[PDB]
Write a protein that binds this ligand. Structure first.
Ligand SMILES: O=C(O)C1=C(C(=O)Nc2c(F)c(F)c(-c3cccc(OC(F)(F)F)c3)c(F)c2F)C=CC1
Ligand SMILES: Cc1cc2nc3c(=O)[nH]c(=O)nc-3n(C[C@H](O)[C@H](O)[C@H](O)COP(=O)(O)O)c2cc1C
Ligand SMILES: O=C(O)c1cc(=O)[nH]c(=O)[nH]1
Length: 362
């Protein structure tokens, strides 16, 4: 029940556990399938993109399952697709705790995990243990994405991503080159035109070298804090290299006027409601700059069917959410899907596909 989780369970749980502990428990419970029984996906929610079928367009954003420990439990939660990561080549602990903060009054979160990761090797074996099961899930419209990061002390960023492509690329439907984390020094500078072109050329060559059935689509995840110039350059490089898609957006280092949370000034990436429209507008811009020819996964502040549809109409073929789950719990997934379907009908769309980029055509 949506009300029970939102009004009693989640609030109570958050009053007993600090945010990081709550997240750990969340991963455990999800991996064990301890979830409230979930909404029947209708044909209207089906979407075909990135060379795959997605039974519904709502996925779990990177960061919740960083090490690929609860993939099956997440599909059970109702997500149309799952994205794990970010995963770094070698294992690393990330930043010291506390590194995640709740801003209840803003329905937001600020985190500075710093790419805490079990590493490629561990995640590789974890995914291989269910590789064939995933193959059937994917064929049944439930794709898997793998988000790649880089180690804090890496001297060659491009090689870190290349290694991720070689090790986890064969186990993913799509790979995400995450160059938008605000918690790794100098990482976002990789979004620059020159560095991005060099980086992505290497990533794509590595990807193309994989055997056909193990060749994933490659997407780039960008920040919501890019200048107009940065966006023009990214769009240019994407079209030049044939990048398969974009994930828009990661968390923001900005602090919108109006934040009420006592922890609003903590260093880190802000997620949730305060990021919603900044992300939607970034999706709108990237869609236009790419002439609607580059698939976009919209992410940032999605907690309702309306939030999802606004991003879809802005140009997103798929959407993801994370923060909303931390406030409303598992039931939010079914809620978003139910509201989205109803809105699609009310607005005269035959299905999700018909609504993609609709705002640009009116
Ligand atoms: O809650 C938090 O403060 C934060 C996070 C979080 O993962 N929160 C969740 C949580 F604490 C849970 F218990 C969740 C779950 C996960 C699965 C089942 C659940 O129902 C229960 F507890 F009754 F079993 C609740 C969940 F999905 C979260 F996102 C991530 C950053 C901060
Ligand atoms: C606690 C936390 C950890 C995250 N970790 C990652 C990560 O490792 N890689 C990544 O690409 N994004 C990461 N993100 C960002 C989310 O994938 C997403 O882009 C962003 O939070 C906006 O969506 P939301 O408002 O629904 O949370 C993280 C977000 C949070 C809140
Ligand atoms: O691990 C992290 O701190 C992190 C990575 C990322 O891409 N985004 C985010 O908000 N946090």
């Amino acid at each position: 029940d949506e009300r029970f989780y939102a009004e009693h369970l989640m609030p109570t749980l958050q009053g007993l556990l600090d945010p990081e502990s709550a997240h750990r428990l969340a991963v455990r419970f999800t991996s064990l399938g301890l979830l409230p029984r979930a909404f029947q996906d209708s044909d209207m929610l089906e979407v075909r993109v990135l060379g795959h079928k997605f039974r519904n367009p709502v996925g779990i954003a990177a960061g919740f399952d960083k090490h690929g420990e609860a993939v099956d439990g997440l599909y059970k939660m109702g997500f149309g697709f799952v994205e794990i990561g970010s995963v770094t080549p070698k294992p690393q602990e990330g930043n010291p705790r506390p590194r995640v903060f709740r801003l209840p009054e803003d329905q937001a979160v600020i985190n500075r995990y710093g790419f805490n990761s079990h590493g490629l090797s561990v995640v590789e074996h974890r995914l291989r243990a269910r590789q064939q099961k995933q193959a059937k899930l994917t064929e049944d419209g439930l794709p898997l994405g793998v988000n790649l990061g880089k180690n804090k002390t890496s001297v060659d960023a491009a090689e870190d991503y290349a290694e991720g492509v070689r090790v986890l690329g064969p186990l993913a439907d799509y790979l995400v080159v995450n160059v938008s984390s605000p918690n790794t020094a100098g990482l976002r500078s990789l979004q620059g035109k020159a560095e991005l072109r060099r980086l992505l050329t290497k990533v794509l060559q590595e990807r193309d070298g994989l055997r056909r059935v193990h060749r994933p689509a490659v997407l780039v995840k960008i920040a919501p804090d890019l200048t107009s110039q940065d966006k023009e350059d990214i769009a240019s490089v994407v079209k030049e290299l044939g990048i398969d898609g974009l994930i828009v957006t990661n968390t923001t280092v900005s602090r919108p006027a109006g934040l009420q949370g006592a922890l609003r000034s903590e260093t880190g990436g802000l997620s949730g409601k305060p990021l919603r429209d900044l992300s939607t507008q970034t999706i709108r811009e990237m869609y236009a700059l790419t002439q609607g020819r580059v698939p976009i996964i919209g992410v940032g502040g999605v907690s309702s069917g309306q939030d999802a549809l606004e991003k879809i109409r802005a140009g997103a073929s798929l959407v993801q959410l994370y923060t909303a789950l931390t406030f409303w719990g598992p039931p939010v997934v079914g809620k978003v899907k139910r509201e989205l379907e109803a809105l699609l009908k009310e607005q005269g769309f035959g299905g999700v596909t018909d609504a993609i980029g609709a705002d640009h055509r009116r």
